[PDB]
């Protein structure tokens, strides 16, 4: 085509294309290499990606995200019923299937999870098209290893609706291993551990690879642990700080909280490269600016338990795979959160100093591998 590889993420999506033996992780119209898996509806327009997430704080009811948590599931599914209680948007039941309901151009409308995700894939498709200067048709789209047939089918349908011919649906951990060339035959079988920590979910997958054939040995994790949870710890920290300094609680002002959450997410990323970060918010509450800062140490302490807890699923995955730490040949980092120095330290210490595969941006590794496989299938 060339064909492309797309990581349809829980919170961010990424598209890459393999040309001249190299993978190109494609930047969007705003120059970002990953795009929010968001879609918004207003009185006049449908927004997608950066444009949608950039207005989430002011239009919470009609800004959709987490469609991946609904995709391929039934309305009465326990997880679906549990998640709805936390989303600002409506999820309704249509013949037993979940649909998000929103207001668009003054009218009420509902979309299936695959329709919402097709909008995200369309955005990724156009992003690739703007870079290639050519129409993009074929693509490989990834999914978590634990996805069932219905979830895989619905993800594929999201692609078809986007005008893409889905060459294949492959597992995210497998895509990651392919990015590092771990799929090449080298004689005996090799055990690869994929440590994936994104913005909303945590997954540990152990794969055994032999003759280019992957075998998911075990999967562990927490579908409700991700970078967004680390931002929450920071948010509460600063809400307390603002109350101390100004004797005012901003907790009930949904927008002040989102602007603070956005500032924390940005500071967090900085703390992965530097030891301190400055928070500066103009007019956060009742015209009061919030200028402060936070140290990496402070950040690590606010999340110490959450970070350390990532090691339990690692132990359990090993146990279920019937392998000992020492039998793992490669450890691959996936997800933007794995860029956090403390998490790398924890994982490495657990593996007694073993080096981590982390040269490819973790939040891009899945798209990277998908792009490689998409080319191979073309
Ligand atoms: N440099 C960084 N340091 C810490 N966290 C990061 C960094 N870059 C991205 N992240 C985080 O990774 C998370 C999710 O991004 P990925 O790109 O992993 O998305 P998804 O949630 O769909 O897997 C977010 O919480 C984001 O804040
Ligand atoms: Cl864009
Ligand atoms: Cl430590
Ligand atoms: K992603
Ligand atoms: Mg991910």
Coordinates of C-alpha atoms and ligand atoms in Angstrom, one line a residue:
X1 CA 0.0 0.0 0.0
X2 CA 2.1 0.4 2.0
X3 CA -0.1 -1.1 4.8
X4 CA 0.1 0.4 8.3
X5 CA 0.2 -0.8 11.9
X6 CA -2.2 0.7 14.4
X7 CA -2.2 0.5 18.2
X8 CA -5.8 1.2 19.1
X9 CA -5.1 2.0 22.7
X10 CA -7.3 2.4 25.7
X11 CA -6.3 6.0 26.1
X12 CA -3.9 6.8 23.2
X13 CA -3.6 5.3 19.7
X14 CA -0.5 5.2 17.5
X15 CA 0.1 4.4 13.8
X16 CA 3.3 3.4 12.1
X17 CA 4.5 2.4 8.6
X18 CA 7.4 0.3 7.6
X19 CA 9.3 1.6 4.6
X20 CA 12.9 1.0 3.4
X21 CA 13.5 -1.4 6.3
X22 CA 12.6 1.2 8.9
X23 CA 9.5 1.9 10.9
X24 CA 8.2 5.5 10.9
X25 CA 6.0 6.3 13.9
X26 CA 3.8 9.0 12.3
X27 CA 3.2 12.4 14.0
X28 CA -0.3 13.9 13.8
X29 CA -1.4 17.4 12.8
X30 CA -0.2 18.7 16.1
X31 CA 3.1 16.9 15.9
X32 CA 2.2 14.3 18.4
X33 CA 3.4 10.7 17.9
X34 CA 0.4 9.3 19.8
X35 CA -3.2 10.5 19.6
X36 CA -5.9 10.4 22.4
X37 CA -8.5 7.7 21.9
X38 CA -11.2 10.4 22.3
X39 CA -14.2 11.6 20.4
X40 CA -16.4 14.7 21.3
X41 CA -19.7 15.9 20.1
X42 CA -20.9 19.6 20.4
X43 CA -23.8 21.7 19.0
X44 CA -21.9 22.1 15.8
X45 CA -19.1 19.5 15.4
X46 CA -17.6 16.1 16.0
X47 CA -14.1 16.3 17.4
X48 CA -11.5 13.5 17.4
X49 CA -8.1 12.9 19.1
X50 CA -6.2 16.0 20.4
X51 CA -9.1 18.3 19.5
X52 CA -11.5 16.2 21.5
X53 CA -9.3 15.7 24.6
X54 CA -8.4 19.4 24.7
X55 CA -12.0 20.3 25.4
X56 CA -12.9 17.4 27.8
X57 CA -12.8 19.6 30.9
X58 CA -15.7 21.7 29.5
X59 CA -17.8 19.1 27.8
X60 CA -17.5 16.0 30.0
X61 CA -21.0 14.7 29.1
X62 CA -20.4 14.5 25.4
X63 CA -16.7 13.6 25.3
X64 CA -16.3 9.9 24.9
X65 CA -13.3 7.8 25.9
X66 CA -12.6 4.2 27.1
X67 CA -14.6 2.7 24.2
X68 CA -12.1 -0.2 24.4
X69 CA -13.6 -1.1 27.8
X70 CA -17.0 -1.6 26.1
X71 CA -16.0 -3.0 22.8
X72 CA -17.2 -6.6 22.2
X73 CA -19.1 -6.8 25.5
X74 CA -22.7 -7.2 26.4
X75 CA -24.6 -4.6 28.4
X76 CA -25.2 -7.0 31.3
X77 CA -21.5 -7.8 31.5
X78 CA -20.4 -7.2 35.1
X79 CA -17.4 -5.0 34.0
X80 CA -19.6 -2.9 31.8
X81 CA -22.1 -2.3 34.6
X82 CA -19.2 -1.5 37.0
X83 CA -17.4 0.9 34.6
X84 CA -20.6 2.9 33.7
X85 CA -20.7 4.3 37.2
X86 CA -17.4 6.1 36.7
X87 CA -18.0 7.6 33.2
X88 CA -19.4 11.2 32.7
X89 CA -21.1 10.0 29.5
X90 CA -24.2 7.8 29.2
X91 CA -24.2 4.1 28.3
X92 CA -27.5 2.7 27.3
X93 CA -28.9 -0.7 26.4
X94 CA -30.0 -1.5 22.9
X95 CA -31.1 -5.1 22.6
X96 CA -28.6 -6.2 25.1
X97 CA -25.6 -4.4 23.6
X98 CA -23.9 -1.3 25.0
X99 CA -24.1 2.1 23.2
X100 CA -22.8 5.4 24.4
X101 CA -25.4 8.2 24.1
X102 CA -24.5 11.8 23.5
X103 CA -25.9 15.0 22.2
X104 CA -24.8 16.2 18.8
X105 CA -26.2 19.2 17.0
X106 CA -28.9 19.4 19.6
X107 CA -30.1 15.9 19.0
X108 CA -29.6 12.7 21.1
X109 CA -27.6 10.0 19.3
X110 CA -26.0 6.7 20.3
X111 CA -23.0 4.8 19.0
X112 CA -21.8 1.3 19.3
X113 CA -18.3 0.9 20.8
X114 CA -17.0 -0.2 17.4
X115 CA -18.4 3.0 15.8
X116 CA -16.7 5.2 18.4
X117 CA -13.4 3.3 17.8
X118 CA -13.9 3.5 14.0
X119 CA -13.8 7.3 14.4
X120 CA -10.4 6.9 16.3
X121 CA -9.1 4.6 13.6
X122 CA -10.3 7.0 10.9
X123 CA -8.2 9.7 12.5
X124 CA -5.2 7.3 12.6
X125 CA -5.8 6.4 8.9
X126 CA -5.9 10.1 7.9
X127 CA -2.8 10.8 10.0
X128 CA -0.9 8.1 8.0
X129 CA -2.4 9.4 4.8
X130 CA -1.2 13.0 5.4
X131 CA 2.3 11.6 5.9
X132 CA 2.4 9.2 3.0
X133 CA 0.5 11.5 0.6
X134 CA -1.4 8.4 -0.5
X135 CA -4.5 6.5 0.4
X136 CA -4.1 4.0 3.2
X137 CA -6.2 0.8 3.0
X138 CA -4.6 -2.2 4.6
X139 CA -3.7 -2.3 8.3
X140 CA -2.9 -4.5 11.2
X141 CA -4.7 -3.5 14.4
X142 CA -3.6 -4.8 17.8
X143 CA -5.6 -6.0 20.8
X144 CA -4.8 -7.1 24.4
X145 CA -3.9 -10.8 24.5
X146 CA -6.9 -11.6 26.7
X147 CA -9.5 -10.3 24.2
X148 CA -12.0 -12.9 23.2
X149 CA -13.5 -13.5 19.8
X150 CA -16.3 -11.0 20.2
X151 CA -13.8 -8.2 21.3
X152 CA -11.5 -9.1 18.4
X153 CA -14.4 -9.2 15.9
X154 CA -15.7 -5.7 17.2
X155 CA -12.2 -4.3 16.9
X156 CA -11.9 -5.6 13.4
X157 CA -15.3 -4.2 12.6
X158 CA -14.2 -0.8 13.9
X159 CA -11.4 -0.9 11.3
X160 CA -13.7 -2.0 8.4
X161 CA -16.1 0.9 9.3
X162 CA -13.1 3.2 9.2
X163 CA -12.5 2.2 5.6
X164 CA -9.6 -0.1 6.5
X165 CA -9.0 -3.6 5.3
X166 CA -7.8 -5.3 8.5
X167 CA -5.1 -7.7 7.4
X168 CA -5.1 -9.2 10.9
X169 CA -5.7 -8.7 14.6
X170 CA -2.6 -9.5 16.6
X171 CA -1.9 -9.3 20.3
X172 CA -0.3 -6.2 21.7
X173 CA 2.5 -8.1 23.6
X174 CA 3.3 -10.0 20.3
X175 CA 3.5 -6.7 18.4
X176 CA 5.9 -5.5 21.0
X177 CA 8.2 -8.5 20.7
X178 CA 8.1 -8.1 16.9
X179 CA 9.3 -4.5 17.3
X180 CA 12.5 -5.8 19.0
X181 CA 13.0 -8.5 16.4
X182 CA 12.4 -11.2 19.0
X183 CA 10.3 -13.2 16.5
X184 CA 13.4 -14.1 14.4
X185 CA 14.4 -17.8 14.6
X186 CA 17.5 -18.4 16.7
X187 CA 17.4 -22.1 17.3
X188 CA 15.7 -22.8 20.7
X189 CA 12.6 -21.3 22.2
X190 CA 12.9 -17.9 24.0
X191 CA 10.8 -16.6 27.0
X192 CA 9.8 -12.9 26.6
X193 CA 8.0 -10.9 29.3
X194 CA 6.0 -7.9 28.2
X195 CA 5.4 -5.3 31.0
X196 CA 2.7 -3.0 29.7
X197 CA 1.6 0.0 31.8
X198 CA -0.4 2.6 29.9
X199 CA -2.7 5.3 31.0
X200 CA -5.6 3.1 32.1
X201 CA -4.5 -0.6 32.3
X202 CA -1.6 -2.8 33.4
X203 CA -0.7 -6.0 31.7
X204 CA 2.1 -8.6 32.1
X205 CA 2.3 -11.2 29.4
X206 CA 4.8 -14.0 29.1
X207 CA 5.4 -15.4 25.6
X208 CA 7.4 -18.3 24.5
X209 CA 8.7 -17.9 20.9
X210 CA 10.0 -20.7 18.7
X211 CA 10.4 -20.7 14.9
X212 CA 8.6 -17.4 14.7
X213 CA 5.6 -18.9 16.4
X214 CA 4.3 -17.2 19.6
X215 CA 2.6 -18.9 22.5
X216 CA 1.0 -16.9 25.2
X217 CA 2.2 -18.7 28.4
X218 CA 0.4 -16.4 30.8
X219 CA -1.2 -13.0 31.3
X220 CA -1.7 -11.0 34.5
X221 CA -2.3 -7.4 35.5
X222 CA -4.9 -4.9 36.5
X223 CA -7.4 -3.4 34.1
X224 CA -7.8 -0.5 36.4
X225 CA -4.3 0.6 37.0
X226 CA -2.5 3.1 34.8
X227 CA -0.9 6.5 34.4
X228 CA -4.2 8.3 35.1
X229 CA -4.2 6.8 38.6
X230 CA -0.7 8.4 39.2
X231 CA -2.1 11.7 38.1
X232 CA -5.0 11.3 40.6
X233 CA -2.5 10.9 43.5
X234 CA -0.9 14.2 42.4
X235 CA -4.2 15.9 42.0
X236 CA -5.3 15.2 45.6
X237 CA -1.8 16.3 46.7
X238 CA -2.3 19.7 45.1
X239 CA -5.9 20.1 46.1
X240 CA -4.7 19.8 49.7
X241 CA -1.9 22.2 49.0
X242 CA -4.3 24.8 47.4
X243 CA -6.6 24.6 50.4
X244 CA -3.7 25.2 52.8
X245 CA -2.5 28.2 50.9
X246 CA -5.8 29.8 50.0
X247 CA -8.3 28.2 52.5
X248 CA -10.4 27.1 49.5
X249 CA -11.4 23.6 48.4
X250 CA -11.6 23.3 44.6
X251 CA -12.8 19.7 44.7
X252 CA -16.3 20.4 43.6
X253 CA -15.3 22.5 40.6
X254 CA -15.1 19.8 37.9
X255 CA -13.2 22.1 35.6
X256 CA -10.6 23.4 38.0
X257 CA -9.9 19.8 38.8
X258 CA -9.5 18.8 35.2
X259 CA -7.1 21.8 34.5
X260 CA -5.2 20.6 37.6
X261 CA -5.2 17.0 36.4
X262 CA -3.9 18.1 33.0
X263 CA -1.1 20.1 34.7
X264 CA -0.2 17.0 36.8
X265 CA 0.0 14.7 33.8
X266 CA 2.4 17.2 32.1
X267 CA 4.5 17.5 35.3
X268 CA 4.6 13.7 35.6
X269 CA 6.1 13.3 32.1
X270 CA 8.7 15.9 33.0
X271 CA 9.6 14.0 36.1
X272 CA 10.6 11.0 34.0
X273 CA 13.5 13.1 32.6
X274 CA 14.1 15.7 35.3
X275 CA 14.0 15.6 39.1
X276 CA 11.6 18.5 39.6
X277 CA 8.7 20.0 37.7
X278 CA 6.8 23.3 37.8
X279 CA 3.1 23.6 37.9
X280 CA 1.7 26.9 36.8
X281 CA -2.0 27.4 36.4
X282 CA -3.4 30.9 35.7
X283 CA -6.8 31.5 37.4
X284 CA -7.5 27.9 38.7
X285 CA -10.2 28.8 41.1
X286 CA -12.1 32.1 41.6
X287 CA -9.3 33.9 39.7
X288 CA -6.5 32.5 41.9
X289 CA -3.4 31.3 40.0
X290 CA -1.7 28.2 41.2
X291 CA 2.1 28.3 40.9
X292 CA 4.0 25.6 42.6
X293 CA 6.2 22.5 41.8
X294 CA 6.8 18.9 42.7
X295 CA 9.9 16.7 42.9
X296 CA 10.4 13.3 41.5
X297 CA 10.9 12.0 45.0
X298 CA 7.6 13.5 46.1
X299 CA 5.9 12.0 43.0
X300 CA 7.4 8.6 43.8
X301 CA 6.2 8.7 47.4
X302 CA 2.7 9.7 46.4
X303 CA 2.6 6.6 44.2
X304 CA 4.9 4.2 46.1
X305 CA 2.3 1.6 46.7
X306 CA 0.9 1.7 43.2
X307 CA 4.4 1.3 41.7
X308 CA 5.5 -1.5 44.0
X309 CA 2.2 -3.3 43.4
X310 CA 3.1 -3.8 39.7
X311 CA 5.4 -6.6 40.9
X312 CA 2.7 -8.9 42.1
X313 CA 1.2 -9.6 38.7
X314 CA 4.8 -10.1 37.5
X315 CA 5.3 -12.9 40.1
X316 CA 1.9 -14.4 39.3
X317 CA 2.5 -14.4 35.6
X318 CA 5.7 -16.2 36.1
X319 CA 4.1 -18.7 38.4
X320 CA 1.2 -19.3 36.0
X321 CA 3.7 -19.7 33.1
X322 CA 5.6 -22.2 35.2
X323 CA 8.8 -20.2 34.9
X324 CA 11.4 -18.7 37.3
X325 CA 12.6 -15.1 36.9
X326 CA 15.9 -16.5 35.5
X327 CA 14.2 -18.3 32.7
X328 CA 13.0 -15.0 31.1
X329 CA 15.3 -14.1 28.2
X330 CA 13.9 -10.6 27.4
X331 CA 11.9 -8.0 29.3
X332 CA 10.0 -5.5 27.1
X333 CA 8.6 -2.2 28.2
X334 CA 5.2 -1.2 26.7
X335 CA 3.1 1.8 27.6
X336 CA 3.9 5.4 28.4
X337 CA 4.0 4.8 32.2
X338 CA 7.0 2.4 31.9
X339 CA 9.1 5.5 31.2
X340 CA 8.8 6.3 34.9
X341 CA 12.3 5.7 36.4
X342 CA 11.0 4.3 39.7
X343 CA 9.0 1.6 37.8
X344 CA 12.0 0.6 35.8
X345 CA 14.1 0.4 38.9
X346 CA 11.5 -1.8 40.6
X347 CA 11.2 -4.1 37.7
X348 CA 14.9 -4.3 37.1
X349 CA 15.6 -4.9 40.9
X350 CA 13.0 -7.7 40.8
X351 CA 14.8 -9.2 37.9
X352 CA 18.1 -8.8 39.7
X353 CA 19.8 -6.2 37.5
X354 CA 18.6 -7.6 34.2
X355 CA 18.6 -5.0 31.4
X356 CA 15.3 -3.9 29.9
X357 CA 14.3 -3.6 26.2
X358 CA 13.4 0.1 26.3
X359 CA 15.1 1.8 23.2
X360 CA 11.7 2.1 21.4
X361 CA 9.4 4.6 23.1
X362 CA 7.1 2.2 25.1
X363 CA 4.0 4.1 24.1
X364 CA 5.0 3.4 20.5
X365 CA 6.3 -0.2 20.6
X366 CA 3.0 -1.9 19.8
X367 CA 2.3 0.3 16.8
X368 CA 6.0 -0.2 15.8
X369 CA 5.6 -4.0 15.8
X370 CA 2.2 -3.9 14.0
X371 CA 3.8 -1.8 11.3
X372 CA 6.4 -4.4 10.8
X373 CA 3.9 -7.2 10.6
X374 CA 1.5 -5.2 8.3
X375 CA 4.3 -4.9 5.8
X376 CA 5.1 -8.6 6.0
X377 CA 1.5 -9.5 5.4
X378 CA 1.3 -7.2 2.4
Ligands
LIG1 N1 7.4 10.3 29.7 C1 6.3 9.8 30.4 N2 6.5 9.6 31.7 C2 5.5 9.1 32.5 N3 4.3 8.8 31.9 C3 4.1 8.9 30.5 C4 5.1 9.5 29.7 N4 4.7 9.5 28.5 C5 3.4 9.1 28.5 N5 3.1 8.7 29.7 C6 1.8 8.1 30.2 O1 1.4 6.8 29.6 C7 0.0 6.7 29.6 C8 -0.8 6.1 28.4 O2 -0.1 6.2 27.1 P1 0.0 4.9 26.0 O3 0.6 6.0 25.3 O4 0.7 4.2 27.1 O5 -1.6 4.8 26.1 P2 -2.6 3.7 26.5 O6 -3.2 4.1 27.8 O7 -3.7 3.6 25.5 O8 -1.8 2.4 26.5 C9 -0.6 8.0 30.1 O9 -1.0 8.0 31.5 C10 0.6 9.0 30.0 O10 0.5 10.1 30.9
LIG2 CL1 -4.4 15.1 14.0
LIG3 CL1 12.8 0.9 44.9
LIG4 K1 -1.5 3.0 23.2
LIG5 MG1 -1.0 0.4 25.6

